[PDB]
Design a protein around this ligand. Sequence first.
Ligand SMILES: [Cl-]
Ligand SMILES: [Cl-]
Ligand SMILES: [Cl-]
Ligand SMILES: [Cl-]
Ligand SMILES: [Cl-]
Ligand SMILES: [Cl-]
Ligand SMILES: [Cl-]
Ligand SMILES: [Cl-]
Ligand SMILES: [Cl-]
Ligand SMILES: [Cl-]
Ligand SMILES: [Cl-]
Ligand SMILES: [Cl-]
Lengths: 517, 521
Amino acid sequence: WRTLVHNGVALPPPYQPKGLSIKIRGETVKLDPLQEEMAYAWALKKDTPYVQDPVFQKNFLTDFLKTFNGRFQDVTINEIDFSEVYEYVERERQLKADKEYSAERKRLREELKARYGWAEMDGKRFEIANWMVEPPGIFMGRGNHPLRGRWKPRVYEEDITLNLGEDAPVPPGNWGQIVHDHDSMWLARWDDKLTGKEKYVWLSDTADIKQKRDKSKYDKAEMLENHIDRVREKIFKGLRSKEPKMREIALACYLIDRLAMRVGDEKDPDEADTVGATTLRVEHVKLLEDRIEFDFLGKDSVRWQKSIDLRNEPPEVRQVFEELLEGKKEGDQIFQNINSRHVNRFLGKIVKGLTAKVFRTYIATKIVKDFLAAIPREKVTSQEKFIYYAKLANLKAAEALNHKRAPPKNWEQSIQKKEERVKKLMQQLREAESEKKKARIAERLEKAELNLDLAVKVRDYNLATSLRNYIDPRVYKAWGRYTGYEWRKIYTASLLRKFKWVEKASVKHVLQYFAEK
Amino acid sequence: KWRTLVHNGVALPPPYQPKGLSIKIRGETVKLDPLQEEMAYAWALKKDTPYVQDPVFQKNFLTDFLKTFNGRFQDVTINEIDFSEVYEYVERERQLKADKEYRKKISAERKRLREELKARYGWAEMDGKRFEIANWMVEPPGIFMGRGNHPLRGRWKPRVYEEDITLNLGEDAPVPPGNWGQIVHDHDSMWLARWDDKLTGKEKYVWLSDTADIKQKRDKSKYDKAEMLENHIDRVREKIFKGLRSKEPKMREIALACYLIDRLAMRVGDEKDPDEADTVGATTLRVEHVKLLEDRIEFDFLGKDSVRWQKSIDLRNEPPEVRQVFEELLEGKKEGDQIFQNINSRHVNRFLGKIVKGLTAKVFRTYIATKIVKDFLAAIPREKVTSQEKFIYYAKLANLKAAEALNHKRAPPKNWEQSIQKKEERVKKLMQQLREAESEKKKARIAERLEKAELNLDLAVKVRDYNLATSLRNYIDPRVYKAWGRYTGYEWRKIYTASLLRKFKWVEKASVKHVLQYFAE
Ligand SMILES: [Cl-]
Ligand SMILES: [Cl-]
Ligand SMILES: [Cl-]
Ligand SMILES: [Cl-]
Ligand SMILES: [Cl-]
Ligand SMILES: [Cl-]
Ligand SMILES: [Cl-]
Ligand SMILES: [Cl-]
Ligand SMILES: [Cl-]
Ligand SMILES: [Cl-]
Ligand SMILES: [Cl-]
Ligand SMILES: [Cl-]
């Protein structure tokens, strides 16, 4: 770049003390501001599973107990009474759900965005992706990070170096450095004060930000594995709720869990014609004694059918379906009060960051993992067999996520052509005694035989949708490492660029699952 | 975009020469066709290695081997096969090699043909400039192996042919002789040739020597060989002892130099690189540097800047051939005489490579230094790694242990004594600035810098006599430090300068499971 101007980064607001106390072994202790700021972060997690994790507890106390001037060094979490801090949190939670409004925050939120959210690079205006420096808080990763529960210390202007053009105005701030690095694209830089990792501020719509955001989705899905039981319990509790809006939302979430059905309002053309909760009409659903049948004919003339065996489903499932169908005509929409905002608000209250898209990524990724884990390594005899199994796993995820498609236009004859190719190769090598020739015919035979079986199996399904969007590429990198074969050949050049981040990423989480025996 | 690109393609392996050998399966003599014999002979070449005792290696090998007998024997297990006839041919041919190869029958002529093939295939022209091609030989087929735990170990690597190979050439470059599978003109690609590995499915590329692709591949290869040595160090040591008992005195001297690699991590001594040229090495030892006592041997080397290096080996549990060869080399020499007069890296690496293909003095000392670092970090409780700066501190103390092990001893820095006092004052001041600290922001900013000052002071004292950079750049597998970062959660990239992060760029993609499993034990 030639010139680059921006207003730096927005630092978090200081913590506001509330005069709260805790009890340690019966002794009331008045919290200092930093003590209270940490006790408050812990309290905000009071209803999460993390505060029951002994590694999480020990890491938190490592930073917490250091603030007590030498006292309480051998205290454990069970000997601290946080109830005063919990009560403040619950009170603020109730107050936040009661102030239906003082909407002058939009002027203040918009004022920050206009001030810090835009950089001007070589005369052009560009949005900044991450201009807010996050406030201090408790560190968390995907579930097994060794530093989980440790405090992330507050970052100040002096820790931050800004990248600016030489003729740009130095924005207000006690910055630690202003560098004129025409070579590098980043806007601001600083070291994370817990992990030692370098933190960068990038323009929106850049390679670094999209790779980060792409990987973050699959990371949330991996984390979901730790919480899926609780999610399912809260979906069913929602179905039993007294509030009809809650029952309807919970039922849409039940359909995500059970059928991997999308919400129905996403506009992306890859899935816009597939079934979704909001496009279900009364005529698409039949409630029977032992099952619920779904039968949906889409715009593309694709008929999608699945059923749910009610034998071992909770009774509240049929109860809410009956409630929503009651009194409606066959052409009426079933889910008339649903959209992605309501669904993701419900899910997000169970697991922060959880959305329907993350949920379906977890589903598709688990299906692929479980399919491949069931294959004895001795059956994976070649690169072609490796690809074949990878694709059958992709197909299982496609059918699970309802990525049904109209058959390829000339599928009928192309199968005979693959059947012809198999036939012709079949005895082409039967009349060739040279083993160098009888070997390079054997190789294309199995490639053709596997490619034929695959071509029959994939006719009605678009595998690309889940391969591009819902299957964690770490599963296929791990499958490559587990078996020895070339997993990059599962992907187009385009998807290899999209998943460039997988090259550096650990696959221990998946590979340990394959290697269990 | 290159504009023109000219080369002669790649050199294909020589065809296998059948020998008319047979094996026995369940007592039935079976005559081997060419491919079966080729595979049986490869297996026989490993008859005295651990690999042929590994059930995974066996199953993989039998998967491809039994496939050659298309109807019969599809049920056979490895113990039902009698390879003794192939074993005998191998032993006969290797005993035959115990007479003359480094003579003129296989010296000048072997040399001449080697240079002839290099002149034919080793050079490309790109945009009118001539460049050496790094890997113009297609490797012959054989039994696949990785670093020790590869899932395809024991599988056959099938022969590659001209018809399998794509060449990348300018549109109007001459088409080199050969039945190439395809000629492309891809101005966006720097590779010269490409084919699929017929076992692993990985795409194989031919590159110019001056590429990142080759530099990175050669850098990682050294550390991979050192990782693989971990499984074989006992056998290597026994073959060193065996060399010490050889009847040829030149092999005995070479063996003793290799023994000093193993026991003291002592370099050969002939490498010109200034990083190590002033440290002790086998070829730099003189009679007065070595005291042979009754149950131990003491080394006392006085080098540049009056730096004295001293280490000793306890001999009482050592095999007597160690003392034997030392006495042999010391006898008839007086003060000032060089002990190892027929030693260089070529002879040493020839000897080591006969034990393990690709093994060299540098690979051996990389294994030593890497194990030292791994063992040091593995013994550290996670509770002690309390911060990024503590993490870096322990990493450097491990680095120092490898420096001491590999004899990278140096004279203390010019102003060390005063550069130690100055840090003692800066910590003294830093503590008083933190007692009078006020705001939380201030109490933490000084705490940050104080902890850094105290650790750096203790480091500065401990590293006075050793150059840590040599082993960090050359002998410590960076996967150890990446794994240390993953085990603890801290940023391992700060262990490295920008230069070393470039050299070790390959570690970003590399698995560290082999080391991390050891830390997580
Ligand atoms: Cl932001
Ligand atoms: Cl975590
Ligand atoms: Cl979690
Ligand atoms: Cl600040
Ligand atoms: Cl949707
Ligand atoms: Cl809700
Ligand atoms: Cl890989
Ligand atoms: Cl090769
Ligand atoms: Cl291996
Ligand atoms: Cl040397
Ligand atoms: Cl690797
Ligand atoms: Cl791995």
